[PDB]
């Protein structure tokens, strides 16, 4: 009922905000894309930022699923290589124009730094802590506090992606940033 209205609005908002940006598309154009009335939409989402919060949830869920698939298919032979593949998976997925617009450009502005970090952590801390735990278990990473290392790496990888997203020469920014991340990673990983 309401569930069908919400899903149509989220799908339409993800589509139009992904192409043009949050700031460039109003709720009436999203209601049209979804095939619902302004009244039906206002019942589900009091304002534009509320609909954006639900779009970010669905997009970050998809980002983490896509990364998990790339890591499973990468052929990583050890936990250290799984971390390396996860970093390359994030640079790949972050380059999707919709992910760049919604997550790297719009989400920090609409959610703020605190809001962005909360979403980032809820979606990525589990996978990141698992990668670290498996590398420590395999003796390829020093025994150390898992949560602080996970948090710092998430902050480093989110900033890496945002640097590429806003660069004058994204292709060169991506190449140079991948090199930095690989050096940083390899300095923690043993052998």
Binding site for its own copies (CB under 8 A): 105, 108-109, 112-114, 116-117, 142, 144-145, 147-149, 151-160, 162-163, 173, 176-177, 179-181, 183-184, 186-188
Query: What does 90 bind: ligand GO5, its own copies, none (CB cut-off 5 to 8 Å by kind)?
Result: ligand GO5
Burial letters 74-111, b for 16+ CB under 10 A, else e:
eeeeebbbbbbbbbbbbbebbbbeebbbbbbbbbbebb
Shortest CA distance to 34 belongs to which of 16, 50, 48?
Answer: 16
Shortest distance, position 184 Cβ to ligand GO5, whole Å? 12
DSSP string computed for 78-132: SHHHHHHHHHHHHHHHHTSHHHIIIIIIIHHHHHHHHHHHHHHHHHHHHHHHHHH
Shortest distance, position 104 Cβ to ligand GO5, whole Å? 7
Q: Which is nearer to ligand GO5, 9 or 181 (CB)?
A: 181
Q: Which is nearer to ligand GO5, 106 or 158 (CB)?
A: 158
Q: Which is nearer to its own copies, 75 or 148 (CB)?
A: 148
Helix/strand/coil percentages in the chain, nearest 5: 80, 0, 15
25, 51, 110, 120: which one contacts ligand GO5 (CB under 6 A)? 120
In the chain the first and final C-alpha atoms are separated, in Å, by 57
Q: Which is nearer to its own copies, 33 or 81 (CB)?
A: 81
Shortest distance, position 101 Cβ to its own copies, whole Å? 13
């Amino acid at each position: 009922r309401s569930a069908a209205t919400r899903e149509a609005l989220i799908t339409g908002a993800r589509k139009l905000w992904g192409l043009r940006g949050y700031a460039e598309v109003g709720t009436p154009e999203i209601a049209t894309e979804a095939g619902v009335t302004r009244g039906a939409m206002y019942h589900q989402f009091a304002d534009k930022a509320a609909l954006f919060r639900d779009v970010v949830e669905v997009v970050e869920q998809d980002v983490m699923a896509r990364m998990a698939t790339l890591v499973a298919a990468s052929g990583a032979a050890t936990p250290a290589d799984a971390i390396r593949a996860a970093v390359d998976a994030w640079l790949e997925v972050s380059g999707d124009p919709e992910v760049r617009q919604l997550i790297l450009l719009d989400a920090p502005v609409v959610l703020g730094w605190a809001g962005f970090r909360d979403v980032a952590q809820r979606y990525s801390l589990g996978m990141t802590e698992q990668l670290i735990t498996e590398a420590i278990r395999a003796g390829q990473l020093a025994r150390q506090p898992v949560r602080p290392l996970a948090q710092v790496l998430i902050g480093a990888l989110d900033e890496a992606a945002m640097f590429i997203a806003t660069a004058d020469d994204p292709k060169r920014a991506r190449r140079e940033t991948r090199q930095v991340l690989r050096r940083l990673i390899d300095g923690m990983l043993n052998g």
